[PDB]
Design a protein around this ligand. Structure first.
Ligand SMILES: Nc1nc2c(ncn2[C@@H]2O[C@@H]3COP(=O)(O)O[C@H]4[C@@H](O)[C@H](n5cnc6c(=O)[nH]c(N)nc65)O[C@@H]4COP(=O)(O)O[C@H]3[C@H]2O)c(=O)[nH]1
Ligand SMILES: Nc1nc2c(ncn2[C@@H]2O[C@@H]3COP(=O)(O)O[C@H]4[C@@H](O)[C@H](n5cnc6c(=O)[nH]c(N)nc65)O[C@@H]4COP(=O)(O)O[C@H]3[C@H]2O)c(=O)[nH]1
Ligand SMILES: Nc1nc2c(ncn2[C@@H]2O[C@@H]3COP(=O)(O)O[C@H]4[C@@H](O)[C@H](n5cnc6c(=O)[nH]c(N)nc65)O[C@@H]4COP(=O)(O)O[C@H]3[C@H]2O)c(=O)[nH]1
Ligand SMILES: Nc1nc2c(ncn2[C@@H]2O[C@@H]3COP(=O)(O)O[C@H]4[C@@H](O)[C@H](n5cnc6c(=O)[nH]c(N)nc65)O[C@@H]4COP(=O)(O)O[C@H]3[C@H]2O)c(=O)[nH]1
Lengths: 271, 271
């Protein structure tokens, strides 16, 4: 009923070298040594002990910490050992708490960057002629950038589009109707004459003057950009919005909606 | 530079119904109504306001709470508004805390379940004759259930094995060597005479008497089961372990190493 270094190591999923190591340092020592083979032998009573020694290591308690507990008799006392552990528990809770306080201060600092980014978003003025776009429309005042959801409805189907004048760039078009809903469209510039994939439309973006803003960030943060633009950015440059169609401009600089390194040009029609 | 319900709703990704709603309740009322179309029109100065109303909603602040704030002047006061929010922030921290306190108490209870399960793990005695097993062998006193790792090394290769006498059941065999290492093997019972997939072995489990323990739980918890077995479960039944080969027994009752619903018979050779 005595166990070998190998049976012990097995049931605890450790290597026999560890158990040798523990023997040299007098931490966990075998009840005896094989008198005809020099092997180490352990009693079943030692199992629960190795179990605690190993329980400490899973808590990253350094080995010598452990050895000190062995030496001063605290490892083999359920009360002292418990004390050691609550102390370590306490430290862990604190280190966690401390970092939480940091994530808040960090959360705080990210916001401040947003006002900074928006402060640096300068208008370039430009006129562009009418042009044609084919893709997936959505007529209607809907909540969400369920457009983030539209784009993901549109991406599997993009390949279907013949006649792409420049497949490197795409558009997130929003048109106003006097009725008051917006008509959004995700698409690609295509020459007239090409066929429209089933369930797709062809939209004509009229000739317009624009203020172009380079949104440098995430697609969900696009709405914030629009908000600044319409609350003050235009005015601050004595520009007036014109009723018309605006669009998001996606080219090489765009690398995914959730990717903070994506730029997107915002084409705001003006007077 | 007045915006429509439609441009407003878009740049905030909400539906125009929401803006109608906010107007009827007097919460967010447009600066005017279209006199030739009865439409609603908003000033760019209302953007930041709608912005905060909506920020509250993202905090699940109910709408009526919000309307209360609007009514009692607090909503338009950066100081009162801030106070409202720290209050709410406070509540959230408390609710989180409370639940942590419960996770700990829950952790404690899970542990107590373990001793209970081990107490109910009864030995059934059984003799089985020698039998042959084919699979992937590991020689050597290794740490970790890198046996968890062996099984996942072995599984892509299982299909290769011809002559499987009973593919429903596999074995996790551990054999002891005089030098004290253990020799582990994951495999299937296969009749003699069948060829051995390259890099695989054929191990012979000798005829033995066993105590069988049904481990009901997770493969990582298998080691604890072994620990109970050799520390006292055998003694309590006046059984004595015999030097030999033990094995884990996987049949239908086994549903995967991570599934708390798996059972595994543990075959412990005895006198
Ligand atoms: N070569 C060697 N092996 C060791 C030694 N100490 C432990 N073992 C291994 O541990 C098993 C059981 O050891 P035990 O608890 O002393 O329990 C032992 C022990 O109580 C007794 N026993 C067997 N042979 C001897 C012996 O030569 N001298 C003594 N004093 N007792 C023995 O029978 C039980 C079963 O022994 P086994 O079935 O042979 O299997 C033995 C043996 O494989 C050692 O000093 N030398
Ligand atoms: N009262 C007190 N005395 C301290 C403290 N830190 C160091 N000492 C003293 O300095 C000696 C060596 O510390 P070390 O180089 O960290 O080397 C230490 C340390 O690395 C490790 N150790 C012992 N206890 C603990 C522990 O509770 N936690 C950790 N992380 N390591 C420990 O074992 C080694 C030997 O320690 P000792 O033989 O006890 O001897 C210790 C101890 O007498 C402390 O925080 N409080
Ligand atoms: N049908 C209708 N539409 C409305 C009303 N209120 C706002 N809008 C829409 O909002 C846009 C800008 O309105 P604004 O800021 O008053 O700025 C307006 C306003 O300052 C001026 N304006 C144009 N027509 C009229 C008018 O009939 N009366 C007044 N007082 N001003 C007008 O020209 C600016 C640009 O107007 P638009 O480019 O046409 O585009 C207008 C129009 O499409 C309304 O009561 N009825
Ligand atoms: N001092 C105080 N008075 C309370 C409290 N709970 C209820 N009352 C009183 O009871 C009235 C109706 O509360 P309700 O039916 O929960 O209906 C409430 C509630 O459903 C919601 N609401 C208002 N303020 C808050 C708020 O701060 N937090 C939340 N979660 N909901 C609010 O809107 C309604 C507000 O109506 P009121 O004009 O405030 O009128 C409130 C208020 O005068 C409280 O915790 N503290």
């Amino acid at each position: 009923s005595m166990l070998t270094i190998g049976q012990l190591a097995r049931i605890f999923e450790i290597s026999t070298k560890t158990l040798r190591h523990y023997d040299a340092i007098g931490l966990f020592v075998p009840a005896r040594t094989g008198s005809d083979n020099g092997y180490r032998y352990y009693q079943p009573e030692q199992i629960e002990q190795l179990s605690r020694i190993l329980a400490l290591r899973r808590l990253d308690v350094p080995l010598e910490a452990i050895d000190r507990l062995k030496r001063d008799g605290a490892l083999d006392d359920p009360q002292r050992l418990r004390h050691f552990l609550q102390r370590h528990q306490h430290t862990l809770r604190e280190e966690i708490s401390a970092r939480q306080r940091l994530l808040a201060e960090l959360d705080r600092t990210l916001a401040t960057l947003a006002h900074w980014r928006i402060r640096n978003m300068h208008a370039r003025i430009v006129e562009r002629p009418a042009f044609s776009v084919v893709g997936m429309e959505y007529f209607g005042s809907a909540p969400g950038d369920t457009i983030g959801q539209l784009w993901e409805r549109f991406i599997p189907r993009e390949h279907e589009i013949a006649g792409k004048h420049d497949p490197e760039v795409s558009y997130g078009i929003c048109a106003q109707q006097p009725n008051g809903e917006f008509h959004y469209v995700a698409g690609f510039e295509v020459q007239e004459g090409w066929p429209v994939p089933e369930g797709m439309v062809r939209f004509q973006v009229p000739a317009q003057k624009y203020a172009v803003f380079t949104h440098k960030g995430t697609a969900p943060q696009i709405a914030e950009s629009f908000q600044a633009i319409y609350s003050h950015l235009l005015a601050e440059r004595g520009l007036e919005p014109k009723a018309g169609v605006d669009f998001e401009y996606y080219d090489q600089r765009f690398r995914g909606p959730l990717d903070p390194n994506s730029q997107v040009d915002l084409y705001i029609p003006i007077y």
